[PDB]
Symmetry: C2
Subunit: 278 residues, 2 copies
């Protein structure tokens, strides 16, 4: 099961890379720097957790594979742009990323701002195209979901809470850092899973179960990260080492449990929760 996953992963990574290169031809005009920055940030980089989730979820319902990949690129556009902006000096001020210089270092601050801005627009351009799905109602569902997942009630909202924690001398509580995770990383994860239910025209019960999986692995992910990282409150600082470890493991079990109404079609999502999140 870990081998079928490790190879799904590689197929996904090379496909997303292909899609981005194809989506981002370098224009023969002064937009050259902008698009080269977009390609620099979007191509080659991450392990494509988000496109992977989209592909693995769409596989529950035998969704058109190609369209599933493009939805993957759309969510990855949002993820990548968020990283470009997060890395900037006024934010996390990071010099490196994938062992490679961040956009504002390789290019400049303004190029980082604009390349991120363009990638957000591109996510919606991609989702909007007819190749995604013939049912227009479907495409609208994906677009509304992504817009909510990306903005003030989603990823950016989470970024903002994180910024508030860093600039406040009042330590946050467990409910607030939980809400922080739900928005900062959980919104995009939730989109990945929900996109599958949408692409498959599934019912509320199935939609709810997939979003619960996303909810639970997202939290497990952050708890694990709060452990790996070792002044603001964290799951480690609030739960302590022992309970944080046990709660991360419990969340993984829970995430898998949400998929229990599925047969073996849900096996990729099971593996993702273990051999990646755990």
């Amino acid at each position: 099961m870990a081998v079928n996953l490790k190879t799904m992963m590689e197929q996904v990574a090379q496909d997303i890379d292909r899609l981005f290169a194809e989506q981002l031809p370098v224009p023969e005009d002064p937009r050259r720097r902008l698009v080269e920055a977009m390609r620099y940030a979007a191509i080659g980089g991450g392990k494509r957790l988000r496109p992977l989730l989209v592909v693995a979820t769409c596989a529950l319902f035998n969704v058109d594979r190609e369209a599933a990949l493009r939805v993957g690129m759309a969510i990855e556009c949002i993820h990548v742009y968020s990283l470009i902006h997060d890395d900037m000096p006024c934010m996390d001020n990071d010099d490196l990323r994938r062992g490679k210089p961040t956009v504002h270092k390789a290019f400049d601050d303004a190029s980082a701002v604009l390349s991120g801005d363009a990638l957000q627009a591109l996510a919606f351009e991609i989702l909007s195209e007819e190749k995604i799905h013939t049912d227009p109602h479907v495409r609208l569902e994906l677009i509304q979901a992504l817009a909510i997942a990306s903005g003030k009630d989603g990823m950016v909202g989470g970024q903002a809470i994180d910024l508030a924690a860093e600039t406040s001398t009042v330590p946050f509580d467990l409910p607030t850092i939980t809400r922080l995770q739900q928005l900062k990383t959980g919104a995009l994860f939730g989109f990945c899973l929900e996109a599958g239910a949408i692409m498959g025209r599934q019912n509320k019960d199935i939609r709810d179960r997939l979003k619960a999986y996303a909810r639970d692995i997202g939290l497990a992910f952050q708890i694990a990260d709060d452990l790996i990282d070792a002044g603001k409150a964290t799951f480690l600082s609030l739960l302590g080492l022992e309970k944080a470890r046990s709660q991360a493991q419990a969340l993984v079990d829970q995430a898998i449990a949400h998929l229990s109404v599925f047969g073996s079609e849900a096996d990729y999502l099971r593996s993702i929760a273990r051999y990646i999140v755990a």
Copy 2:
């Protein structure tokens, strides 16, 4: 015509303020600052030129007025976020915009980055809702058009060309600054006019006439801007390249050209006609 135009402008301004206020409730969780930054930028502008164009174009056909206004809010999301990101120290460093301190000044740099980021997302959320149009294809057409108009092949692409001009010692030529305008400001104007055609379920011939109007007023607007800014005093501009007399006459000709695209409409197009003349 200018009298009704002023009235429409004041009305659109009030409506857009109402709509943004309703769209942006302030949470008591730590997202408070983000949303207050969004409200600060979006509310109490602001001539709302882009909402005005949407409203005046939808008026050509039988489009629900509140729906037209919401599309106006959506395009204004893109415009406002673009100003927030443009004012930042990384870009133009403006501490002020029409007597109003910029977001990074009233708040901080990080809040300006995020409030702009959230506003771009908000534009697409707004367009996706059924409130806009019962027909799903109308909404999808608007969304596709906005994403193209906003990104690397639109507004941000234009922003990039401008940034390239400012950080190079090689003066751009007429073709390049023409492309610069088409993208930097022309793309959003194009959306405003095309949105009216889309909301009105209009044919390709009508859509093209409207986009041609946007193209012409957008160029005229930039030429007039190149003129205005010069009156109040080294990258190439329409003024530097064309010279004073040619830039003046071309701005004027472009207004006439913009209006001529509307010759197939009756008095319902008077707002758009006035707006074009106003852009001078």
